[model samples]
Target: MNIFEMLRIDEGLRLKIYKDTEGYYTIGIGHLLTKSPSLNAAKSELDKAIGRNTNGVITKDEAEKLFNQDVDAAVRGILRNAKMKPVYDSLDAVRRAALINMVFQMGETGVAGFTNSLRMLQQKRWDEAAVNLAKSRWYNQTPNRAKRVITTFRTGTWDAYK
Candidate 1:
């Protein structure tokens, strides 16, 4: 099938505004609209289109295009950390992917506070970086996921979750 059809199957075509798995407001096949002015505008516009309190929709093609844009924005979010720029650039693609995953799970600001971990990474102290990763509350809260990511940091290899 075509790409649009595949995306529809993956994200599901939800014509109404609803909370995502993480409880963020989402519409149009996972187009996240945070609780903010932009969300208000999107809700108002969708309401106008389908009338108040009604579900609204776009074609699957539109949602696919939107997903493309969202991917770009996610990459931009990873690059927004100035302090981590050089460190990020130094890693191979596998380790970089691990770093990107970390930043995505924790926002740029949240990961920014991992100063000691980042410093360990910059110094090429892979084991120390893994230890620092394990010491974080993120690791404590989600040990399995944290282990996979810490394994990537320690070995600089692509390790998928169980």
Candidate 2:
């Protein structure tokens, strides 16, 4: 499956606005309007995404567009990160997808903090990478998703496709 599809599994679609685990207003497949430039701007984007000035409903197509933008940003973020780009470029497609998935979930700074894990990945030490990742807040907060991502790293396969 494509990384986009895999992320769809990692992040269940929600057509209506709701508070995320961190209590941020989010909508449409993990698109955190809370992360927008500002809450005021976020609300405007929210209305646009849901196609209901304030109705809190989103069409699948609208959600898809939002997802595409988000996934693209994740991919680009990984590729452009000075610290991550080399390791990201050296990885195979499945591993690359796995990395992108991580970046999407944790953001560039959060995942880049996985220094030991990233180093292990660069050295092709899959098991080490997985082990280090397992000992993270990401794992604690969402074991199911982290488990899948860990497997993808360990196996160098799309084993995380949920």
Candidate 3:
């Protein structure tokens, strides 16, 4: 099946805005409702559309728009970081995508906090970068994801899903 199908199946379909299990405002599957700058600058047009109705709803297509906007913002943030583009551009598309995915989860600032890993990346020391990545609270919090990212950095291969 395609990626959208997989995600829809995994996240389930929600046609209405509701508080997620963690109490975050959510709608249209797993899309989080927020005015955070990470999703948009200025103001949240989405929130405006929904008004003050915390229980407001949106269509699947509307959710897709939000998802695309989030992904775009994540990529822009990654490209804007200093010392990131040079290393990011040097990688194959798969590796580049992997890095973008990491940045999406942690933001550019958070990724920059990986001093040793960033340094190793700048120096083109893939194995060292991977090792440094493994030596983090992130690894402790999410070993499986950490392994995927670290392995991708080390081996220059994408193997997260397969």
Candidate 4:
């Protein structure tokens, strides 16, 4: 499956205001408005880019456009990091997509915390590295997602039944 489609299922589409697990004001596929440089900046961005109010309703169309932007930023953010790209490149395409999915949800810095796990990935020790997910706070933050992608890392396949 494509990363976009997997992420859309994992993140879901909510057009209303709500707090993320971090208590930040988020909307439209986990866009964290409160984490922007400023509320005014976020508001202006939404108004200009999506033509919606930050504190008001966002249409499905606008949400999808913003989702595209977020996905692009996630991939770009991984390459921009000093320690990520080499390890990110040492994977099968399926593992690469899972890594991108991880960076999409947690940022590059967050993924960088797993030094040994990443090294195992670079070493191509697939299931050996997959076990490391159980030790991270990220696993606790979203166990279902952790298990889901860990399965991908373990098997290196995009197998799905539709």
Q: Determine which window of 10 residues in candidate 2 has minimal summed lDDT.
A: 34-43
What is candidate 1's lDDT per residue for 21-127, written digit by digit as tens? 55666677567656444656667665554345544455565555666665555457767768888788888776776776666456688788999999999888998
| lDDT over C-alpha atoms for residue 154 of model 3 | 77
Instruction: List TM-score per model, in order.
Output: 0.63, 0.89, 0.68, 0.86
**Cα lDDT tens digits for candidate 4, 77-140:** 8888778889887787888888988887788888988888998889988878988866889888
lDDT, model 3, position 65: 68
Tens digits of per-residue lDDT for model 3 on 1-162? 223333344346677665554455566645666534333421254467445433365667777766666567767887887768776777766567667666755668878788767778767788878888888887887677668667767776544445
Give the per-residue lDDT digits (tens) of candidate 2, residues 41-107: 6678788755668666677888898899989999899888989998998899889988998998889
- Sequence-dependent TM-score of model 3: 0.68
Q: Whose lDDT is greatest here?
A: 2
Clashing pairs in 2: none
TM-score of 4: 0.86
TM-score comparison, 3 vs 4, better candidate: 4
Over 4 Å off, model 1: 1-32, 35-68
Which consecutive 10 residues in model 1 have the weakest lDDT in total?
Answer: 1-10
Give the local distance difference test score of model 3: 0.64
**What lDDT is reached at residue 128 by model 1?**
82
Cα error, candidate 1, residue 99 (Å) = 1.0
Stretches of model 3 off by over 4 angstroms after superposition? 1-46, 49-57
Model 4 alpha-carbon drift over 4 Å, by segment: 35-55, 159-162
